[PDB]
Structures are given as structure tokens and as C-alpha cells.
Design a protein around this nucleic acid. Structure first.
Ligand code: FES
Ligand SMILES: [Mg+2]
Ligand SMILES: [Mg+2]
Ligand SMILES: [Mg+2]
Ligand SMILES: [Mg+2]
Ligand SMILES: [Mg+2]
Ligand SMILES: [Mg+2]
Lengths: 115, 293, 86, 109, 168
RNA sequence: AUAGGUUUGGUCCUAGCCUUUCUAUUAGCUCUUAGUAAGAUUACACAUGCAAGCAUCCCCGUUCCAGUGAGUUCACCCUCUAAAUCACCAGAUCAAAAGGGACAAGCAUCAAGCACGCAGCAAUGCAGCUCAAAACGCUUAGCCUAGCCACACCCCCACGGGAAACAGCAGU
């Protein structure tokens, strides 16, 4: 489908079945459908912990670097995954959400103790 | 220095000890069968074909390397404590770039505590299996390697099968690989089944293990009983090479031992069953003279 | 066997058969020595030598005759007329 | 070099010289038959610009692709005449030949 | 039975059994040969046997035959650069002709196997997708992972139909 | 196909039809639970609700996603090179238009098409071009499925007209 504009984005294509999410980190034209055509599959992400309590993320780091050099963008979930991996700095919203969670749990603990 | 398992002299000695039984090496495999093909061959053509099969058997019996147990991986890359408590599950990030040796891939783990460490050896092997699956290897360790099942396979005398499963499932430096190989070698020693590994690629490893543990008495006894006295002599020479400052080697050097003399010297020194070895050698020599004269 | 009665026909046929026995060479006592393509009148029989445990994948009549002969493993395709006698 | 014509080099037979400075060339390619798995000749027609008009019906010619089509159908130029009709010169010996017979014996030189 | 003499020539196995894969430079191959003469037997058998294999291995090279046009048989390759390679095949057998053309204008085994490895690069073992492209279709096929809900139902606590009940 | 039934008074051969196998839709009868996948027959007409916002105003988006299969060799490779991304440029990536090639089925009781070519800077000249190796034509069909092509009420298009549009979701 001849698209106007748009750009390559490294993003998560959601496969899996109902209640069984699974993601394919793909470099795809941003205008293409979420689970539709893609240029290259750069990795995968299993949000469900496995038998060992691990969320398996596979990153084709060489090709991710190649596409970032070619000018691909990064969806925020992929940015946060890379930050977790250490490939990028931790996302500002990762840090801020951690801080918000800390404040919320501090409130909870303080209220529980007061009670 | 002391020679290693991969040195050329040791490789030659161990290959000669192993032997190249074509029937055993190319024993028919219980697998999906296709109808056979038939060729008309002269005597020269048949000799050429058997020579090619011998070369193929050498390739097939190429010994696996003996590698020291890998050291545990403990290396923390980052300590981002801000992530502490944000997630309750580990993330395992794998570099699945195609053109990278699996011992060079970066497989890191982000823990719930915010620690970005390097994946342990077990996790590394598990993830490499997950993403670059190998034929014959399973992610979850097969239960056959539990002692209760390993002893069943030993009782059936499937030591070669146990070693094959171990070599398919674990890495040569794996703790489990080394443990299972040593256990199989020990059981072969106890039950005197050293012929189960002859003409297989694991005979070299078994011999190396016995030599390094100074327990080649049983193997010498079996070889003399089976008349492979050249193999026994090479085994004793290898033992002396790997223990140059040993009582038996020094005694042989003091005397002039160049064969059955070497085996007798080993029987008299550095042998837990020296009397038995001497009896076996005496019986072999007596039979040799009997059917020679 | 020809007879006005079915049992007499059976007796005649099975008694005459034993005086007209072939001997079939079986490779390793389970199959034939090589692939055989033949045409008897308008019936083509294409028999393939097969490995052990393959079974008899043949016309049912060929399966019966092979069980009698002693062949365990063989493939067989019958083209043309399927006349049982031919 | 960067020609937009698919067939860069094609050897064909001239089947018509009725157009000025153009030679109609029949180029045959072996095309596998998917069912019979046998190679048959698939012939296509190419117009080859011939500036000098030196092509005769029956000549085997080598056509080179023009950098761009110079006409609605003339995408090739007459690169060479490999076998002039009736005036073949055996490439092996460079002597004129009439079919399988040497018009000049190669021993002549 | 298969029609024609030597019906093995009409099998994919035979066609792929050819070992000549021309360099990218070769564009045309004209095979001039004589239908008669004991010296042209090699060229005759070449056209009868190996031309199908050469064409199968090189689908984009125009192979064109010529009959009784010159006293002696010969191949002539027209390359992309404009060069012409003449290969006089008189007195050679078809096997010798194949070896010669492979030596002078065919890709070497090293180049062919590097091209094979380059092709292999595309099919990454770690990619998940349809069977036509990937070894596995979903991570659920990997042991130790949460299995496919179709085969093994998920825990009610992991099903949103009951997370909703809990949140209600 | 490992075949089987069926012509005859009978046998042999050829031969069509049918059985046995696996799917999909529909219908009859029957039907307990759980998980998952799939889900109008109709390119016929649509009540009703929602499906495109964001943002310190400018811009950007509503050209995407989602839908359908009416039409249908616009999809694939090469050349060239727009628009777009790479904070600017960079060549890299992606990819239009244009040029070259390849590319569905049936009917030859569709066998001729009727200007379908070339050269020249132009003026103009030559009379050529496709086709029984299937041109021209009629009919049928979404396709080569990580998806692609085409359409988007009809007049192929949509200035204009007919007319007032769910082939977006739920629904009629
Ligand atoms: S196909 Fe993988 S979860 Fe269902
Ligand atoms: Mg029903
Ligand atoms: Mg009619
Ligand atoms: Mg239609
Ligand atoms: Mg409508
Ligand atoms: Mg319209
Ligand atoms: Mg609707």
C-alpha cells in the first residue's frame, strides 16, 4: 500500500492469544498495521514470567543499532525495554513512575502505621 | 609443562588406544529407514570404499575436548536502585545477533532489585537454547541425568548413550557435563566395562580421567586380558608422562623399561592392584609362549 | 479349480497348487531383491523393495500372496486391468 | 551501464529489415517447461537500431541495450553481426566457410 | 514410462546436478555445433546433456544453439563488459567442455558456498512468525513459557474475565 | 490409491459412473461444562448511538487504522528519481510517478487487428506494426497470503452530475 510520509519505527507487534500476550520487536513503517507488514524482526518480548520467573526479552542489538542509524524511531515501550536492558539510559518516565510508586507506598505504610 | 588432552602426542596415543572398529562405529542406527542402494565394485574399488569409511570413522571418533570447569559468572553491570520494587520479576535480555559466538553473546539480567548483572552460566545456556535451538538439547534439564535414572542406564549398559545425551544437553565445561562424564567413567571402572567406550569418541576422555586420577589399574588389567599390550604400554607411558615426578615413572627411568617392562614397573609401583596386574600379565605371557612355541 | 460345488472347487484348487509351487528368493527373508516392473497381459505390477518394518503396501491380493510366500516388506502398485488371475 | 532496458545483451536472428535504420530481430530463449521439465525455445521480437543498414534477413546479430529507448519499440542497437547470412567466417580459424565446408582451407596460412 | 531417450534429463535431480554457475558477467552463450562428424561428438553430447543443466543453473543467461553453421564446433560467451570468450570444443568430450567452461567462466565453490551462507543469514533462528519463514510461531511453543491458552487454560487469576470480577 | 462395485448367458479388454478418505457450508435429529480460534449469503437499502483528536492559539492528524472483493495481469525484479525519516546537512533507509522485463483461467464456433511502426533536429519521408509460438475479442476470477492488489454510493475518474451513501463498530 503506497503510503504518504511515515517513517520506520522500532515497535512491539502483539501476537499471542487471548490473555497470553507476546510481542515481536519489529522495525516497521509507522503507518502500517500494528501486526501487519514489517521491514525486519529485531527481537521478542514475553511479558508473562516463565517457569523461572523471567520475562524473556531478545534484542537483535546489531540490527537495532543498524535501524536506529538508518533513522528508525522507537516506541516508548521499546525505549523502556532498552533502558531496562541498559542499552539506553533509563527512561525519564521509568524513573518518575518508580518515584511515584515509592511515594504511594510511603503513604500506604504511614497510614497503616498511624492505624 | 605437563601435556594437555589436546596435545598431539596425547591425541595420537589416545586414538591408538581407542581403535577404529568399523562395525561398532557405523553400527546400524534405529531410525527411519530408506531402501538401500547397491554398487558393483572390484577389489580395488572395495578397498577404496573401506578406506573412505575408515577416514569417516576417524572424523566421527574425533575426541571431544576436555575443558576445565567454567568459573561462575558474577559481574554486576549497573546498580540502578531507583527501579527497586517497580517490577517483581526478572528480565533476561539476550543479544540474538546472528554472527556472534554463543560464548560472546551478551545475556544480561535486570533483577527486581534494579541490578543489571550478567546472566549466570545456566541462564546463558538456557537462553541460547531458547533463541538458537540446538538439535538434541532441551531447555529444562532432562530427568535422565538424575542418579536414579543414570543408574538404570548403567545397569542396561548404556554408558555411551548417557555420554551422548550429556554431550547434547550440556556444554563441555558445564558442571553437569563434567559430573555426568565422571560418574559414567567411575561406573565403567567399577563394573569393568571399558570395552563399551572403545571405538567411541569418549574413550579418550575416559582414559584422560583415569590417568589424571591415578586409577588406570583396571584399564591396564582389561587391556592385558584382551591382549592389547601395545595399548597397555602406551597407557603406562602416558601415565608416566602425566606424572613425571611419580614413583613408578622414576623407577622406570632408573631401570630400563621399554614395554612389558614398563607395565611390570607400573605394577610394582603406583598401582592399587599391582599383584592382580602382575598375575594378569603373567597369564598373558604364559599363553603367548604357549601358542608361540 | 473348477467345480459344480464350491467345496470341491476349493479342494481341487488347493490340491493342484501344491504341485505347482514356485520358489521365491527373498532378500534377508523379508523382501524382494530389487524393484520389479512387469506387465502380464494388460496388468502392470510395479513392486518396490523396501526396508525392514515398512510393511506390505500392496493390493490386498498381493498382500495375501506375499504373506504366503514369506515377504514382510514391499510396496506394489497395480496399474491397467486389475484382473485377479492375471 | 545504468541502462533502463532489461536485456543488456541479446543474440538474435534478423527476420525483417523493412524499417529504415531498424532491424527486426527474433531472440530465442530456452524456457523450462514446468510439467515436462524440458527446455523449449521461447522467441521474442526485438527492434534493433541499425544506423548503417548493414543487416540482412537471416543474419545472426548481437544487440546491445541502448541507455534509453530511442523509440516506442527500439530499445536495442546493433552491436555486431556475429554470422552474416551466407558469409560466415569460422571464428576458430578465421577462414570463410560454406556450412560445414571450408571455402578457404585453413592450411592456406 | 518417461518419454524420450534419456528421460533422466527431464528430472529436477538431473537438472540441479549441474556444477556450472556462470559469473554475473556472462550474458549470452552461443553453442555452434555440427549434427554430424565424429569430431563434434563432444559438442553434440554437450548440447544433449549439459545445456539443460547450464540453463537451469543460470536462468538469466541466453543460451542459443546453432547447427552446421561452421566446420568446427565452438562455444562463444558474450559478457556484460562487451568481451567475447571463444571456446573451441572440437575433439573435447562434453565433460571436458563442462570442466573448461566452469574453470574459465564459472563461479568457484568458495563463492557459491559464501552465497549459500549469505542466504542462510536471512532465516534467523530466534525469529517468531509463520511456519513459512520462522521455526516457531509463538513463544508459547518454547518449553518453560506460559503455554498456549488453547491447549492449557490459563489461571483464572491470569484471565481478564476474572481480573474484572476482582476489580468489580 | 493397496483399491473396490457396476456392462455380459459367460470371459477378456477398453471405458464412464459410483464407494471407500479429508475438509468447508447448509439442513434434519440431538446437545453438558471449560479454554481457544473463526464467524451476514448479498459492492442491495439503512433507523439509531459511537468510530479523530491534540495543543498556549500556529501548525500537525483526521490521506493512517478499520472495511469489502465490485472491478482486475496497477502487486514482483531492474533503471532513474520524487515525497518521507535520520534535531540541520548527510549519503543511509523507505518508496511514488516514469522507462524495461515477468505475470490468472476458459473459448480459435473470438483468426485476423485496422494504424495498431520506423527514421528525421524539424520540415517531412518510408509503409510499416501485432498475430495459429494465439494478436484482436467474449466470459470467469481478488492474488503469487509475515501479506499484496483494487475499491471506497454510481457516472472506470469526479470539475460536474445523479443523489444524499455503515464495503468503520454495534444494530436493522
Ligand atoms: S500461539 Fe502462542 S500463545 Fe497461542
Ligand atoms: Mg449441524
Ligand atoms: Mg457455435
Ligand atoms: Mg468478481
Ligand atoms: Mg453502501
Ligand atoms: Mg468512484
Ligand atoms: Mg456493520
Amino acid at each position: 500500500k503506497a503510503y504518504r510520509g511515515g517513517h520506520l519505527t522500532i515497535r512491539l507487534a502483539l501476537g499471542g492469544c487471548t490473555n497470553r500476550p507476546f510481542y515481536r520487536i519489529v522495525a516497521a513503517h509507522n503507518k502500517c498495521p500494528r501486526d501487519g507488514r514489517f521491514v525486519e524482526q529485531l527481537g521478542s518480548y514475553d511479558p508473562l514470567p516463565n517457569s523461572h520467573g523471567e520475562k524473556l526479552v531478545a534484542l537483535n542489538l546489531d540490527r537495532i543499532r543498524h535501524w536506529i542509524g538508518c533513522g528508525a524511531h522507537l516506541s516508548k515501550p521499546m525505549e523502556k525495554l532498552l533502558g531496562l536492558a541498559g542499552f539506553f539510559p533509563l527512561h525519564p518516565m521509568m524513573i518518575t513512575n518508580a518515584e511515584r510508586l515509592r511515594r504511594k507506598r510511603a503513604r500506604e505504610v504511614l497510614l497503616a502505621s498511624q492505624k | 609443562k605437563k601435556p594437555t588432552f589436546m596435545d598431539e602426542e596425547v591425541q595420537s596415543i589416545l586414538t591408538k588406544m581407542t581403535g577404529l572398529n568399523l562395525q561398532k562405529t557405523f553400527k546400524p542406527a534405529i531410525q527411519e529407514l530408506k531402501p538401500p542402494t547397491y554398487k558393483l565394485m572390484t577389489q580395488a574399488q572395495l578397498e577404496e570404499a573401506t578406506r573412505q569409511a575408515v577416514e569417516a570413522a576417524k572424523v566421527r571418533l574425533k575426541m571431544p575436548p576436555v575443558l576445565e570447569e567454567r568459573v561462575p559468572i558474577n559481574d554486576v553491570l549497573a546498580e540502578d536502585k531507583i527501579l527497586e520494587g517497580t517490577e517483581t520479576t526478572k528480565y533476561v535480555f539476550t543479544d540474538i545477533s546472528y554472527s556472534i559466538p554463543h560464548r560472546e553473546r551478551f545475556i544480561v539480567v535486570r533483577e527486581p532489585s534494579g541490578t543489571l548483572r550478567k546472566a549466570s552460566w545456566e541462564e546463558r545456556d538456557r537462553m541460547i537454547q531458547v533463541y538458537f535451538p540446538k538439535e538434541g538439547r532441551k531447555i529444562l534439564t532432562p530427568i535422565i541425568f538424575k542418579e536414579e535414572n543414570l543408574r538404570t542406564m548403567y545397569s542396561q549398559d548404556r554408558h555411551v548413550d548417557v555420554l551422548n545425551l550429556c554431550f547434547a544437553q550440556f556444554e563441555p565445561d558445564s558442571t553437569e557435563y563434567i559430573k555426568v562424564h565422571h560418574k559414567t567413567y567411575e561406573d565403567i571402572d567399577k563394573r569393568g566395562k571399558y570395552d563399551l567406550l572403545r571405538s567411541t569418541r569418549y574413550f579418550g576422555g575416559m582414559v584422560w580421567y583415569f590417568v589424571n586420577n591415578k586409577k588406570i589399574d583396571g584399564l591396564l588389567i582389561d587391556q592385558i586380558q584382551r591382549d592389547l599390550i601395545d595399548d597397555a604400554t602406551n597407557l603406562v607411558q602416558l601415565y608416566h608422562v602425566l606424572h613425571p615426578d611419580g614413583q613408578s615413572a622414576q623407577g622406570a627411568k632408573d631401570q630400563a623399561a621399554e614395554g612389558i617392562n614398563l607395565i611390570k614397573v607400573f605394577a610394582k609401583t603406583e598401582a592399587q592392584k599391582g599383584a592382580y596386574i602382575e598375575l594378569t600379565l603373567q597369564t598373558y605371557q604364559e599363553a603367548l609362549s604357549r601358542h608361540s612355541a | 479349480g473348477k467345480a459344480t460345488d464350491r467345496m470341491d472347487a476349493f479342494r481341487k484348487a488347493k490340491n493342484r497348487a501344491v504341485h505347482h509351487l514356485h520358489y521365491i528368493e527373498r532378500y534377508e527373508d523379508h523382501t524382494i531383491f530389487h524393484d520389479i516392473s512387469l506387465r502380464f497381459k494388460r496388468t502392470h505390477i510395479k513392486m518396490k523393495k523396501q526396508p525392514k518394518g515398512y510393511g506390505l503396501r500392496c493390493h490386498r491380493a498381493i498382500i495375501t500372496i506375499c504373506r504366503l510366500i514369506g515377504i514382510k516388506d514391499m510396496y506394489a502398485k497395480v496399474s491397467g486391468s486389475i484382473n485377479m488371475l492375471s | 551501464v545504468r541502462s533502463s532496458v532489461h536485456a543488456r545483451w541479446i543474440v538474435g536472428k534478423v527476420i525483417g529489415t523493412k524499417m529504415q535504420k531498424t532491424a527486426k530481430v527474433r531472440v530465442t530463449r530456452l524456457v523450462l517447461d514446468p510439467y515436462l521439465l524440458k527446455y523449449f525455445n521461447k522467441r521474442k521480437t526485438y527492434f534493433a537500431h541499425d544506423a548503417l543498414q548493414q543487416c540482412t534477413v537471416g543474419d545472426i546479430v548481437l544487440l546491445r541495450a541502448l541507455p534509453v529507448p530511442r523509440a516506442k519499440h527500439v530499445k536495442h542497437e546493433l552491436a555486431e553481426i556475429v554470422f552474416k547470412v551466407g558469409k560466415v567466417i569460422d571464428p576458430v580459424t578465421g577462414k570463410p566457410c560454406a556450412g560445414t565446408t571450408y571455402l578457404e582451407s585453413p592450411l592456406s596460412s | 514410462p518417461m518419454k524420450g531417450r534419456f528421460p533422466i534429463r527431464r528430472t529436477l535431480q538431473y537438472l540441479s546436478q549441474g556444477n556450472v554457475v556462470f559469473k554475473d558477467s556472462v550474458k549470452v552463450m552461443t553453442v555452434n555445433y555440427n549434427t554430424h562428424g565424429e569430431l563434434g561428438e563432444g559438442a553434440r553430447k554437450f548440447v544433449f546433456f549439459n545445456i539443460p543443466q547450464i540453463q537451469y543453473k543460470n536462468p538469466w543467461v541466453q543460451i542459443m544453439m546453432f547447427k552446421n553453421m561452421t566446420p568446427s564446433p565452438f562455444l562463444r560467451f558474450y559478457l556484460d563488459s562487451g568481451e567475447q570468450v571463444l571456446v573451441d570444443v572440437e575433439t573435447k568430450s562434453n565433460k571436458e567442455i563442462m570442466e573448461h567452461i566452469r574453470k574459465i567462466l564459472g563461479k568457484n565453490e568458495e563463492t557459491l558456498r559464501e552465497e549459500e551462507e549469505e542466504k542462510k543469514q536471512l532465516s534467523h533462528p530466534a525469529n517468531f512468525g509463520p511456519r513459512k519463514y520462522c521455526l516457531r510461531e509463538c513463544i508459547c511453543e518454547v518449553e518453560g513459557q506460559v503455554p498456549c491458552p488453547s491447549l492449557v487454560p490459563l489461571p483464572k487469576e491470569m484471565r481478564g474475565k476474572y481480573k474484572a470480577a476482582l476489580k468489580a
